């Protein structure tokens, strides 16, 4: 019990739940919403765009994994799905160049589109409100200036490097007034996409649609989304004198610092100790330190690919876990 995962030099201990009635005779911690609503707290650390950092307290490690798997898979987004080629005489072959276009992020958010229905025949499948079309036409020619030889092939040739910003959004009908205030752009518009030499052109258009992340990893909105737990170091005997500086170079440089008054070690700013278990090797700190990791303090860290704010997907992950367990509260059980 006491919800502390026990780090030692070859194992970890009691990693499982033990939070259920029928574990001891005094069958406590039954389910109760008001007994849950008091202890659950959230502490938001440094928050900006394209990164979030926030804590979730006193939830069991079963449901903290449920929010990780939904941000990667279930929360939908947009990316390319069909690439139509005009004349391409570049050295990069077609369905490689059509594959690097699919993974490019887009700054348009979902909820602007509907789910495509592929049951229909393939000419009204792409309607006017579930698909935006974007294209590019670019040709490399010779630049007529006078440098000398062997210089940068950014001025011997004009536009000999194509970038992600070359995807000119080509708005179809019925949406020239809807996407007017916020046009779509690649979320990182400096991505190198191909290379050209004079006489070689690239001309295509793509039909980017609404897709689910767990189908293909074009569609995933996060860069990556995982979590940690809070580390915890206990000091049994006072380390004093010469040893406490030897005790200090076996850690990341922030986590423990010397008391400047009396030469004794204590814990500085925590949450920075990655578990290098370096104090286990030295057989003089075999009794002075009993370090661990608490089992109800999840250090989340989500990131975005550029489509939307990082505090939006974590709102949208918990919103669709409820609907995932609401859709089968309301359907009959067939025998």
């Amino acid at each position: 019990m006491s919800n502390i995962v026990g780090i030692e030099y070859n194992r970890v201990t009691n990693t499982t739940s033990t939070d259920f009635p029928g574990f001891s005779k005094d069958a406590e911690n039954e389910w109760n919403v008001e007994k849950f609503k008091k202890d659950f707290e959230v502490n938001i650390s440094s928050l900006d765009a394209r990164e979030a950092n926030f804590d979730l307290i006193n939830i069991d490690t079963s449901i903290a994994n449920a929010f990780r798997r939904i941000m990667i898979s279930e929360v939908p987004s947009v990316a390319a799905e069909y690439v139509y080629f005009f004349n391409n005489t570049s050295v990069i072959q077609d369905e490689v160049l059509a594959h690097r276009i699919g993974l490019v992020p887009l700054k348009v958010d979902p909820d602007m589109l509907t789910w495509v229905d592929s049951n229909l025949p393939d000419d009204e499948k792409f309607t006017d409100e579930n698909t935006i079309v974007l294209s590019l036409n670019v040709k490399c020619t010779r630049n007529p200036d006078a440098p000398k030889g062997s210089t940068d092939p950014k001025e011997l040739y004009n536009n000999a490097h194509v970038y992600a910003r070359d995807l000119k959004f080509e708005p179809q009908g019925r949406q020239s007034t809807t996407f007017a205030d916020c046009p779509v752009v690649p979320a990182d518009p400096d991505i190198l996409l191909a290379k050209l030499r004079p006489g070689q052109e690239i001309s295509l258009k793509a039909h980017c649609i609404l897709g689910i992340g767990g189908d293909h990893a074009k569609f995933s909105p996060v860069s990556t989304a995982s979590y940690r737990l809070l580390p915890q170091i206990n000091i049994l005997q006072p380390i004093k004198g010469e040893s406490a500086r030897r005790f200090q170079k076996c850690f990341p440089p922030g986590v423990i610092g010397i008391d400047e008054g009396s030469d004794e070690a204590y814990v500085k700013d925590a949450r920075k100790d990655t578990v290098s278990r370096e104090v286990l090797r030295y057989e003089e700190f075999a009794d002075k330190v009993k370090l661990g990791r608490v089992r109800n303090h999840f250090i989340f860290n989500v990131e975005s690919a550029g489509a939307m704010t990082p505090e939006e997907i974590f709102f949208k992950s918990v919103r669709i876990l409820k609907n995932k367990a609401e859709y089968l509260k309301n359907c009959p059980i067939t025998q």
């Binding site: 995962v5 990693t15 990893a217 074009k218 995982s226 089992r295 860290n301």
Partner: protein
């Protein structure tokens, strides 16, 4: 065991490799130079055009599909482009000039009902030679060809009846997957007799069956392709690319991969490539000093969570980057299936050869294994009914 397989690992060939027309040329899309180099590979300039790329191996057992040196990789890394090969295959024809002064012709796209292309001619072009840039499927003539019917008759020195004598003999794309036409050229040989050399193209993705290696001699069939969210993750979110089981290192005694992972992880965190040579190389005690400054364990053995259940793993997992070169011998061109096909002429049995439309040999080592069971009705069925049946009517007296 590695020298016999280093000559099979796909990769890059030369700088002129999109110019040449060879019989069968394997390519990899995005190769990478290895992390633990050698002095030998920089004296032949191997890393100037390498073969294979270095995954992030987390050696552990997982879901039981990695038992007999099979291995487990994730679906999200393949879609980002982990090991997408490409296969090119020449085929050629020769337009032959005969004794009676008759050539060959490449007429094509016979029509029906307001449309020129048949199903078989959607990618054949106007001039007879199939069109560069669009795909072919099964069927779908891509070099049309006609050969005359007076192929060996004596030249009649006149001009009476020569207006329609060309019977067809096209070239049909077989194969179980649609492939694209890369480039088709036409030229002439040393003696003036024209050549045609079209070169197809398909790329594919590594589904299970596709044989990977380790550069130290540990073969492995890809066993399962699980999703990203079921793979484990460390504190930072690094999902491993490939999981191999722990149960090779006692029997195979490969301490190289256990060192290659330490000398590789410490090179990433320091930004410098490291040397593994013979009878020397980068030492171990000076390589854990880098690996403890950056914050990780002194033996590279990090700790990580699980993606199915959420909580920590009761042990520690040996984690790091290992160079996994991809080999040949994929299953896209080894699946065979013969139901009832061609038969040879002198023996009236199925035809030996996968290219000769197969049928497999129930030998003499496998005939004795059947009779040891005592089974006496499928032995008659597997050796004359489904193979070699024939109805003989024989006379009774003077019986032959």
């Amino acid at each position: 065991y590695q020298c016999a397989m280093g000559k099979q690992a796909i990769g890059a060939i030369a700088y002129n490799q999109f110019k040449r027309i060879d019989t069968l040329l394997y390519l990899m899309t995005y190769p990478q130079q290895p992390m633990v180099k050698t002095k030998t590979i920089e004296l032949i300039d191997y890393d100037k055009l390498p073969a294979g790329q270095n995954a992030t191996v987390a050696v552990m057992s997982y879901s039981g599909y990695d038992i007999e040196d099979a291995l487990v990789l994730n679906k999200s890394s393949i879609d980002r482009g982990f090991g997408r090969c490409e296969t090119r295959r020449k085929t050629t024809t020769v337009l032959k000039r005969y004794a009676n002064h008759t050539q060959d012709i490449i007429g094509g796209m016979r029509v029906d009902e307001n449309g020129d292309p048949i199903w078989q001619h959607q990618s054949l072009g106007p001039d007879g030679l199939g069109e560069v840039g669009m795909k072919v499927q099964s069927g779908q003539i891509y070099i049309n060809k006609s050969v005359p019917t007076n192929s060996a008759d004596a030249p009649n020195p006149n001009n009476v009846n020569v207006q329609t004598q060309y019977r067809e003999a096209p070239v049909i794309y077989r194969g179980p997957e649609p492939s694209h036409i890369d480039q088709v050229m036409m030229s002439v040989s040393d003696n003036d007799q024209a050549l045609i050399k079209v070169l197809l193209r398909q790329n594919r993705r590594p589904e299970l069956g596709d044989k990977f290696s380790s550069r130290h001699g540990q073969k492995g069939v890809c066993g399962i392709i699980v999703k990203q969210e079921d793979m484990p993750f460390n504190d930072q979110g690094i999902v491993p690319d490939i999981i191999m089981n722990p149960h090779g290192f006692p029997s195979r005694m490969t301490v190289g991969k256990m060192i290659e992972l330490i000398s590789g992880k410490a090179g990433v965190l320091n930004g410098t490539l490291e040397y593994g040579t013979c009878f020397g190389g980068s030492k171990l005690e000076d390589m854990s000093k880098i690996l403890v400054d950056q914050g990780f364990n002194y033996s590279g053995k990090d700790m990580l969570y699980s993606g199915i259940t959420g909580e920590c793993l009761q042990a520690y997992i040996f984690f790091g980057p290992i160079y996994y070169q991809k080999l040949k011998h994929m299953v896209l061109d080894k699946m065979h299936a013969r139901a009832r096909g061609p038969r040879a002429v002198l023996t009236r049995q199925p035809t030996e050869g996968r290219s000769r439309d197969g049928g497999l040999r129930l030998g003499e080592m496998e005939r004795d294994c059947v009779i040891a069971y005592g089974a006496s009705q499928l032995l008659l069925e597997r050796l004359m009914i489904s193979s070699d049946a024939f109805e003989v009517d024989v006379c009774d007296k003077c019986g032959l």
